Design an enzyme around this catalytic site. Sequence first.
Site, PDB file in Angstrom:
ATOM      1  CG  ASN A  98      -1.733   9.587  -8.139  1.00 50.42           C
ATOM      2  OD1 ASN A  98      -1.141  10.591  -8.556  1.00 50.42           O
ATOM      3  ND2 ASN A  98      -1.620   9.155  -6.884  1.00 50.42           N
ATOM      4  CD  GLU A 117      -5.940  16.112  -3.819  1.00 52.32           C
ATOM      5  OE1 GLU A 117      -5.327  16.438  -4.860  1.00 52.32           O
ATOM      6  OE2 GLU A 117      -5.732  16.649  -2.705  1.00 52.32           O
ATOM      7  CG  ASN A 143       0.148   7.768  -4.117  1.00 53.56           C
ATOM      8  OD1 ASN A 143       0.825   7.907  -5.134  1.00 53.56           O
ATOM      9  ND2 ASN A 143      -0.325   8.798  -3.421  1.00 53.56           N
ATOM     10  CG  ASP A 193       2.736  10.973  -2.606  1.00 56.90           C
ATOM     11  OD1 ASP A 193       2.025  10.378  -3.441  1.00 56.90           O
ATOM     12  OD2 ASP A 193       2.934  12.203  -2.670  1.00 56.90           O
TER      13      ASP A 193
HETATM   14 FE   FE2 Z   1       1.790   9.830  -5.679  1.00 62.66          FE
END
Ligand code: FE2
Length: 287
Positions: A98, A117, A143, A193
């Site tokens: 990611n 997820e 993240n 995020d």
């Molecule tokens: Fe992200």
Amino acid sequence: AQVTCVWDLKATLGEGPIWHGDTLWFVDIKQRKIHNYHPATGERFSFDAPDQVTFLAPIVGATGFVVGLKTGIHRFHPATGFSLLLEVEDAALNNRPNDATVDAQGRLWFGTMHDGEENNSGSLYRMDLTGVARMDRDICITNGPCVSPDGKTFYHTDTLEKTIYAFDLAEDGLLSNKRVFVQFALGDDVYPDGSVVDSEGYLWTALWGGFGAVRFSPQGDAVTRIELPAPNVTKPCFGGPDLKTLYFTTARKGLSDETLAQYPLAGGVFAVPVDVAGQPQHEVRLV
Ligand SMILES: [Fe+2]
């Protein structure tokens, strides 16, 4: 300041923006594309990837990017495509890379995640010329790895737990003294995020479901919030001649047709001037 939608791209999952060569590079994970935007001219370029592509990083002493594909860490060159550098995880996990960052020593910090997820199978990795080390584990969606200008603090986000952690970062690249930095209570469906740290050590965090981004002091208090006409904002990126233009990627993933009609610029690239400059992009020392 006024926000500008500089590219009405309607990306499914715009992500991983970096400022490189005086232009903006980023990905659309789910459309399997690398994108490049030149703000001085408006020119746009796009490259097809053979799998989901999730982050980009320039290399010390070489051309091209190191990129995260679902199938492993690859080298990318526009002229020659993708070449496998290293497979970091067993494919049976159904994981993918990611987010990623490059610290001032040229180390690439990147996370993995369950592509579905659901499972807590993702990890944090540190890649450099001494190899790849697993630094944290048991995270569903990692993240926003990022480091402070003085290089002594490292941040990492567990998105579904709505928590950003802070760590002590040693000169030899080891982490210690993990603690909660920020826990989000901005709404039932608002999740952190991606994040970056600016030149003053403040954290900018993009909000999934939160229509924008929040700037946090090094002590962890919100000092400003930027609103964008897009429900899902994925990552900030400092660019422009003075690193005082804050770019944002956004995502249409997860939004109903009715919401997309209401917020049609969802998935676009946005830009806004800010008062404090970001940190210069670093290059990965792969050899
Ligand atoms: Fe992200």
